[PDB]
Design a protein around this motif. Structure first.
Motif, mmCIF file in Angstrom:
data_model
loop_
_atom_site.group_PDB
_atom_site.id
_atom_site.type_symbol
_atom_site.label_atom_id
_atom_site.label_comp_id
_atom_site.label_asym_id
_atom_site.label_seq_id
_atom_site.Cartn_x
_atom_site.Cartn_y
_atom_site.Cartn_z
ATOM 1 N N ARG A 246 0.881 -1.166 0.000
ATOM 2 C CA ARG A 246 0.000 0.000 0.000
ATOM 3 C C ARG A 246 0.920 1.218 0.000
ATOM 4 N NH1 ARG A 246 -1.312 -1.831 5.230
ATOM 5 N NH2 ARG A 246 -3.182 -0.636 5.797
ATOM 6 N N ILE A 247 0.807 2.045 -1.029
ATOM 7 C CA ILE A 247 1.676 3.217 -1.144
ATOM 8 C C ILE A 247 0.993 4.509 -0.684
ATOM 9 C CG2 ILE A 247 3.199 4.521 -2.718
ATOM 10 C CD1 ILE A 247 3.973 1.549 -2.253
ATOM 11 N N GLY A 248 1.727 5.294 0.084
ATOM 12 C CA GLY A 248 1.192 6.545 0.559
ATOM 13 C C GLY A 248 2.117 7.649 0.123
ATOM 14 N N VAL A 249 1.559 8.845 -0.038
ATOM 15 C CA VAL A 249 2.325 10.009 -0.458
ATOM 16 C C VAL A 249 2.228 11.160 0.536
ATOM 17 C CG1 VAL A 249 2.650 11.714 -2.267
ATOM 18 C CG2 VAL A 249 1.970 9.388 -2.829
ATOM 19 N N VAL A 250 3.331 11.886 0.677
ATOM 20 C CA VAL A 250 3.390 13.040 1.562
ATOM 21 C C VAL A 250 3.946 14.274 0.848
ATOM 22 C CG1 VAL A 250 4.327 13.990 3.681
ATOM 23 C CG2 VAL A 250 3.675 11.576 3.550
ATOM 24 N N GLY A 251 3.087 15.285 0.710
ATOM 25 C CA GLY A 251 3.451 16.538 0.067
ATOM 26 C C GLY A 251 2.897 16.632 -1.339
ATOM 27 N N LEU A 252 1.798 17.345 -1.541
ATOM 28 C CA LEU A 252 1.231 17.441 -2.882
ATOM 29 C C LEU A 252 1.659 18.689 -3.639
ATOM 30 C CD1 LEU A 252 -0.508 15.924 -0.774
ATOM 31 C CD2 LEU A 252 -2.424 16.357 -2.309
ATOM 32 N N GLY A 253 2.838 19.193 -3.301
ATOM 33 C CA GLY A 253 3.341 20.382 -3.952
ATOM 34 C C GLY A 253 4.123 20.156 -5.233
ATOM 35 N N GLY A 254 3.735 20.925 -6.250
ATOM 36 C CA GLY A 254 4.362 20.895 -7.564
ATOM 37 C C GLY A 254 4.946 19.609 -8.107
ATOM 38 N N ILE A 255 6.193 19.332 -7.736
ATOM 39 C CA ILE A 255 6.889 18.130 -8.198
ATOM 40 C C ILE A 255 6.051 16.883 -7.922
ATOM 41 C CG2 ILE A 255 9.066 16.846 -8.190
ATOM 42 C CD1 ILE A 255 8.730 20.351 -6.440
ATOM 43 N N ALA A 256 5.448 16.822 -6.744
ATOM 44 C CA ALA A 256 4.621 15.683 -6.391
ATOM 45 C C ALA A 256 3.613 15.350 -7.497
ATOM 46 C CB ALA A 256 3.893 15.973 -5.093
ATOM 47 N N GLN A 257 2.836 16.358 -7.894
ATOM 48 C CA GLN A 257 1.786 16.231 -8.920
ATOM 49 C C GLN A 257 2.326 16.096 -10.334
ATOM 50 O OE1 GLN A 257 -1.241 19.501 -8.265
ATOM 51 N NE2 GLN A 257 0.290 20.221 -6.793
ATOM 52 N N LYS A 258 3.559 16.535 -10.534
ATOM 53 C CA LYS A 258 4.147 16.509 -11.856
ATOM 54 C C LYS A 258 5.022 15.290 -12.068
ATOM 55 C CE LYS A 258 3.818 20.492 -13.668
ATOM 56 N NZ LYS A 258 2.666 21.262 -14.280
ATOM 57 N N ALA A 259 5.641 14.809 -11.003
ATOM 58 C CA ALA A 259 6.541 13.678 -11.132
ATOM 59 C C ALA A 259 6.092 12.427 -10.423
ATOM 60 C CB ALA A 259 7.922 14.066 -10.641
ATOM 61 N N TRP A 260 6.199 12.430 -9.107
ATOM 62 C CA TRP A 260 5.821 11.268 -8.339
ATOM 63 C C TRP A 260 4.399 10.762 -8.520
ATOM 64 C CZ3 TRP A 260 9.836 8.709 -6.931
ATOM 65 C CH2 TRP A 260 11.005 9.355 -6.502
ATOM 66 N N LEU A 261 3.389 11.580 -8.242
ATOM 67 C CA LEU A 261 2.007 11.101 -8.383
ATOM 68 C C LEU A 261 1.699 10.343 -9.668
ATOM 69 C CD1 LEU A 261 -0.056 14.008 -6.942
ATOM 70 C CD2 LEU A 261 0.114 11.703 -6.014
ATOM 71 N N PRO A 262 2.091 10.892 -10.829
ATOM 72 C CA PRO A 262 1.822 10.209 -12.100
ATOM 73 C C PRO A 262 2.531 8.869 -12.178
ATOM 74 C CG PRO A 262 2.186 12.515 -12.471
ATOM 75 C CD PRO A 262 2.663 12.229 -11.069
ATOM 76 N N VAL A 263 3.544 8.688 -11.336
ATOM 77 C CA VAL A 263 4.308 7.440 -11.298
ATOM 78 C C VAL A 263 3.681 6.420 -10.340
ATOM 79 C CG1 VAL A 263 6.491 6.361 -10.690
ATOM 80 C CG2 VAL A 263 6.486 8.582 -11.785
ATOM 81 N N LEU A 264 3.100 6.926 -9.252
ATOM 82 C CA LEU A 264 2.490 6.115 -8.207
ATOM 83 C C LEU A 264 0.986 5.862 -8.415
ATOM 84 C CD1 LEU A 264 4.177 7.938 -5.156
ATOM 85 C CD2 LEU A 264 4.882 5.772 -6.142
ATOM 86 N N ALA A 265 0.439 6.318 -9.536
ATOM 87 C CA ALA A 265 -0.976 6.104 -9.815
ATOM 88 C C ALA A 265 -1.152 4.927 -10.779
ATOM 89 C CB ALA A 265 -1.601 7.375 -10.397
ATOM 90 N N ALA A 266 -0.387 4.918 -11.875
ATOM 91 C CA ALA A 266 -0.438 3.828 -12.879
ATOM 92 C C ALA A 266 0.432 2.677 -12.379
ATOM 93 C CB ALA A 266 0.086 4.319 -14.230
#
Lengths: 305, 304, 305, 304
Positions: free
Chosen positions: D3-23
């Motif tokens: 189960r993956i969790g994320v901390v910090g939805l600022g800029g890079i998060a939404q542009k880099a990490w999130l798109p990687v941890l969603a698909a």
């Protein structure tokens, strides 16, 4: 907020026509379906998305749907969806038959629905920026080559499946008003497309569309020779211009996806906006079968000599 | 060691030809002559070149002459030089008028002299190199532009003094059996050329010649789309090809001599070689007027 | 008008230091000589130039002479010419010995003659244009590599024969006032130079000189990182700069020789002008042994550890 | 399937990490949390990510968490996340202070958890590709600039939030046993970093890190001078090498995913893999603070 459905396994869609729905703002991704009820179940789960079991349901619970499945299916799919009163945006080929297309364009209007073709290219930031510069253009040439993809399908298929993209973009860039002066079509012994190049004339402006399936390189370029400038665009990504002060490379926005450069995003958005505002899409009605009518005119000749 | 003479000390002469005809171990520069005679003496001294007050004077003291002066005076100069038993290497337009050009060619055949047109581009390493890879070519486009050169001369001068280069090179690179399919010409109200583009067809291969006098770029390029590779050549200096494993930039040695890359050197060597070896140059006979026959037709049709 | 003599067979001279005299305006090429009375007779004839039979005659009938012969001979040659009261312009290494050089610099002054080193690089159009831009430079790095030239000579030779060029140009570009912070010298088993890189500091500005004799490429570059711009120069021919509006390639003058780009021409001219105007050359006196003093400082260390 | 969790939805998060941890097919995103909670809810909805009002809430529902928030809050977040038996992947500076960073590393070893620093550049295809060609390298320079980013934060933040990238990548690419030889730091009167350059030496090899906050170019590059070849990598996307037969441009497939070229994808995969396989990540232990130990020293010396 509108509910959007997606029809299209994941061959290509998974790469672009899918991560492009990883936006969600003003509309929602209300499930997706595909003919191969197998190689689609995984992506639906991995992307955490509703997997319609049949096109019937997917259409039932949607307001509009993006169709990115086989070109052979486009007609039936769009035909079904339209009948379900759903708004549709079909990938490049409306139908693998000119008439069939002019019929979907009728149905769509006759049912106060919006039907537009997904010419992602008319929405690529660099191609649109170029279009506002070709006022004094004298020469316009576009190339789209494959390293080694002599497709198993015949000439006809590859014409509506690939060359259509070149003709569409080229004509749209010139203002949509050229004539087919000449050109050539080369096929191997298997009747498979090997090469294609044609020349159009929109007044003084000379247009050239060019495609080779075995050029040992997968490159796409656009060259413009205007009065006062020389502009070149590689892969919808690079932009070079010469205005007498030396060659200039336009800066590439640091954080920009490739799905945005190819015009995918801007195409979806323009689709979603037309639904709500209830306006005519940029590629609907006449603009949806235009280039196809040309591609057809060619084939009708290269199959009589 | 033949005696080399030069005609026309204007610009290109001093920048291209002269520097090629001075450093010679197989021949010697013995004179020069311009139809202006103005500053001509100071120029010749600059190169230590005995100035000739007359053609028949320069001719009476040479074996072979490189002509490069106003396209109009070409006929009068060439025919004279040919009547004096002197091999000549004319500059691009053999003569201003087509029949005239042929007249000179014939006059050279009877007189048994070597008469060739100086098409430096046919001797450019990279262009000749490319001519050997187009066996499976399908598309070939040559582009030659100017940043802002809608110079005084009219369409007719420009077609013969610049667009000819593109038309001759392109046809030469693609076998040499292409046919004109169409194109366009644009001129301002003064009648000065602004843009020109044409399409030729040698079988399945499509050829394109393009030239704009005001495109903001003095760039020259050749594009080839073959079966299994894509080749690009910019300003006769840069070579890029893509054969499935990434674009490659052919290396450029200390041999980097604009005069050599552009083919001037090889053109001279080839001329003199044919003279001494009594062989037929690559730019003689029908070959010294193949493109001109084409360019002329384009112009005539425009004026109709 | 001055009479100019040339000393220097034709290994390199024939390529540049010879076609560069194919100008003639304000001065004349009054013959040339070289130690190899053989591989020099041809060029003298092919170029239609007087072949002095000995340095004695060549000096006798000249006012100034360009010396482009072996570095080992530079001293004697210049020493002879100066004594003949002739003005001289010696190629890069003044003498293969620091003292010997400081002596020629004395002789030359002590005899009211002008002696300057031929640092063609301080006269390359692009390097000079750059120098007027490094006001706010923070980093300056120059590279000069050979594809495969592990020279038969030892480290010492190659240092004064090649690396000196990098150090000279680098220091001249920074304003001539840097310190040698560190660096390295790598030689193979034959004691032959393989690599060299050093770091200088002219206040905040960090300078780097770099050379590799077996990098599989013969490239020369200069990189500048200043406040507001990023500039790069390849082979004294290409010029790219970035000032926040995208990468810009300065146009290369249509008809420009390579002998002019490397600074050869501008060097000769500046030599010829100083003679007449009787002014101090840009690379004379202290400016002639500067970088050599540094190159020497290095070697003196890399030969004690 | 962790189960993956994320901390910090600022800029890079939404542009880099999130798109990687969603698909993801091997894991699932189960929550998110920002120290601001502002617009956080709308963001999470955008990604269909159950917003966590608290860390201990996000932790109580995850197995592994990718942290990316103000470098200062890192320690407090990591130590907490580690006390809740949750594997974490921190963003660049493990912690704001060096001792703190080590504290967390130790805390992870005792707790038997996988704690690594997210150095995406160590997983960039082209950089890892280059690391295998520097066996005979002599010179290595990494350049990372900004067009005009003398942003609000001071020298200390910039050294840890940006210059660290260069220092860690360079050291990683060159074995990892280099020594600081010298360099400089420049700041305006406000104390904001303007420029930084340093030189390291791992034997004969010379390494250079360079970063200017206002050079008119947001370019990133790596230059290698090896024995028998010259390699250049620009913005982790373009690869050019010259091995005696002309410059070559390695091909760029449809795999063209900025998130992949820049190493984000591989970084995530590597983290999760280590967690499930109970192995040591490439960016853990001494490796998660090797460059920081260096950058800190540089700063301390500047302030002395």
């Amino acid at each position: 907020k509108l509910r959007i459905g997606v029809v299209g396994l994941g061959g290509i869609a998974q790469k672009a026509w899918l991560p492009v729905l990883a936006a969600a703002s003003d509309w929602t991704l209300q499930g997706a379906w595909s003919p191969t009820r197998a190689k689609a179940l995984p992506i639906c789960e991995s992307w955490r998305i509703p997997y319609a079991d049949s096109l019937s349901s997917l259409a039932a619970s949607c307001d509009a749907v993006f169709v990115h499945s086989s070109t052979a299916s486009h007609f039936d799919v769009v035909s079904t969806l339209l009948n379900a009163g759903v708004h549709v945006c079909v990938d490049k080929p409306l139908a693998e038959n000119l008439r069939d297309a002019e019929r979907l364009v009728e149905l769509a209007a006759r049912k106060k629905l919006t039907l537009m073709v997904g010419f992602n290219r008319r929405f690529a930031p660099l191609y649109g920026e170029l279009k506002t510069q070709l006022a004094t253009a004298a020469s316009l040439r576009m190339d789209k080559h494959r390293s080694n993809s002599v497709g198993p399908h015949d000439l006809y298929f590859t014409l509506l499946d690939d060359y259509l993209h070149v003709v569409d973009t080229a004509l749209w860039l010139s203002g949509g008003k050229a004539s087919l002066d000449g050109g050539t079509l080369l096929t191997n012994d298997a009747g498979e497309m090997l090469f294609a190049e044609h020349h159009f004339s929109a007044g003084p402006l000379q247009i050239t569309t060019c495609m080779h399936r075995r050029a040992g390189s997968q490159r796409e370029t656009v060259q413009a020779v205007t009065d006062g400038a020389l502009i070149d665009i590689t892969d919808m990504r690079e932009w070079r211009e010469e205005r007498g002060q030396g060659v200039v490379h336009k800066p590439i926005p640091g954080w920009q996806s490739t799905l945005e450069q190819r015009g995918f995003v801007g195409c979806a958005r323009h689709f979603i906006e037309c639904v709500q505002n209830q306006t005519v899409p940029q590629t609907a009605g006449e603009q949806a079968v235009l280039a196809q009518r040309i591609v057809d005119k060619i084939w009708r000749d290269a199959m009589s000599e």
